[PDB]
Paper text:
The main negative regulators of Nrf2 activity are the proteins Keap1 and β‐TrCP, which target Nrf2 for ubiquitination and proteosomal degradation by interacting with degrons in the Neh2 and Neh6 domains of Nrf2, respectively. In this manuscript we describe some of our recent work in characterising the binding behaviour of short (heptameric) Keap1‐interactive peptides by X‐ray crystallography and in exploring the SAR of analogues that incorporate unnatural amino acids.
One of the early approaches to developing Keap1 inhibitors was based on the native peptide sequences of Nrf2—sequences 1 and 2—and related proteins (p62, 3, prothymosin‐α) that interact with the Kelch domain of Keap1.8 Such peptides have high affinities for Keap1, with the most active examples having IC50 values in the nanomolar range. KGaATo date, co‐crystallisation studies with Keap1 and peptides have used relatively long linear sequences of 14–16 amino acids, as well as one 34‐mer sequence, with only one example of a shorter cyclic heptameric Nrf2‐derived peptide. In each case the peptide occupied the binding pocket of one of the two Keap1 proteins in the unit cell and entered into interactions with the vacant Keap1 Kelch domain through polar interactions between the C‐terminal carboxylate group of the peptide and Arg380 of the adjacent protein.
Numbering used by the authors:
A (entry chain C): 2 to 8
B (entry chain B), C (entry chain A): 325 to 609
Amino acid sequence: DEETGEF
Amino acid sequence: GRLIYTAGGYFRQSLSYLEAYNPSDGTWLRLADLQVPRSGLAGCVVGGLLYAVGGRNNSPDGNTDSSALDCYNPMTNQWSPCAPMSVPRNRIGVGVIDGHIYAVGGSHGCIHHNSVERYEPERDEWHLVAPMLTRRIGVGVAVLNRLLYAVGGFDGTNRLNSAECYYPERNEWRMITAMNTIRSGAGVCVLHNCIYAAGGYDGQDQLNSVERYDVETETWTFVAPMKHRRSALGITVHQGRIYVLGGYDGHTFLDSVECYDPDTDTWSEVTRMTSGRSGVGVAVT
Amino acid sequence: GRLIYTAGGYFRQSLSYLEAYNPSDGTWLRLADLQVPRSGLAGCVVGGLLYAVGGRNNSPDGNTDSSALDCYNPMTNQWSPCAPMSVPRNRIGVGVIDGHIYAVGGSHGCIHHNSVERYEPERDEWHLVAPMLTRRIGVGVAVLNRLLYAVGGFDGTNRLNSAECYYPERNEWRMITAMNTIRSGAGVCVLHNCIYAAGGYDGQDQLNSVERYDVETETWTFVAPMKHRRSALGITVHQGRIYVLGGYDGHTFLDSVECYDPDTDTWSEVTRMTSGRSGVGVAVT
Ligand SMILES: [Cl-]
Ligand SMILES: [Cl-]
Ligand code: NA
Ligand code: NA
């Protein structure tokens, strides 16, 4: 999530 | 006339879009959807077909890593599947040499791969080649001088600034000079005779710094940074410019495309994507 | 006069809500928020207190699976933290036997647990019991005949239709007849002498089918389907009917609440929830 923002 | 394809991505969930941008006339085409959505997939073009490689399908009710190789024919507007790789690879990086696709690293559950493998399209077959010295995911890959460069990434524990390099004839890896910045999730390409590493994430913040490598000198040196910090972005090269598409900036998912003219060492906002997203695959045919 | 509680959940983001439906008067209650937002938690009532176990906090600040055990007193409208579990468990399953809380399976990052552990509310302590035969996340848990039943789920590679059964006196797990459908994130409950499984996700579509298990028959026969396909639905029983609450249908996050009447093998829509959501925890007071 901090490199791509996914959950 | 050449097109900039973007495939997949992620916004709220992994996505199925294939869209192309025409950089001369400024228009976006909506093409056939991917059968299976993915983000952190990688794109490339080999002999007229466009290939979508790897990725992961993040749905609200489950994730599954892709091992898939998917093959889009612009003249039929049709996807269709090709032989899959030996393992699933999320946050893969990809490069082409002599018409063979190299799939380097990426994640599969808890595995952070260092294995890499090479697809021969004439045979619809994958075979493994020498693994990297480093486990890398969210890696950047570029071809320069018929060598494969694997830049930055994440090894399951540390985000990287190291970079190593593969010799196809010899089938061996060698580390090369490390980057000034730790970069997991950067965009990496070659333009003129240098390898650029744009944005990414350093462990604290998403970046807009761009540094570039030079085989002559054997050093990384920064150039003009992008307007927008971004990580998990798409990158390709068209005419003589770098094009970055998309990404996560820490707060929102960008629809911004930025173009880098190296003659002037400046970036400009050319077009915006039909909707913001991260983790696209990008290629040019 | 008893209440159906719904806790946390997910819509764009993990949720904090604690609301309570009154099946008699048909009204909704807004009770004290949770302290950390959570989707994929489970709820249970033991001792006139309400317990919210594990889950995940998807915020725009990051992911973190929970090992929290949070405890709501309804006479004070107050949540207090109780002792946490050994291990974060997202997409957790819970069942109570003899006023002891069994936390079954679930995920922590990349790890898919088969660990099980049992909370003693008296001592405020968690201890492990015999781990189950299969890694299971998104598992449904039901208690029937003083036995603990873990139905379906996802094991990190495939979604499952296997079920298995815990013997607390003996501290061991034995496998039972598998379901007809493979279901991760279904709603599993006990009604009459039947273990019901409604809804879920088979890595592919969402489900509207419902089957029940029959320990004498040892088979899994199908019954009437739900109006809506629901994965990560919340389930509970009250006054001789099954209540399913929200979920994801593949397209939107349902606020629908359906009620199954076993006398007539039919479902009907009772009141909708205030906002659609999925991955809630549900208990009856
Ligand atoms: Cl990811
Ligand atoms: Cl693997
Ligand atoms: Na990361
Ligand atoms: Na990436």
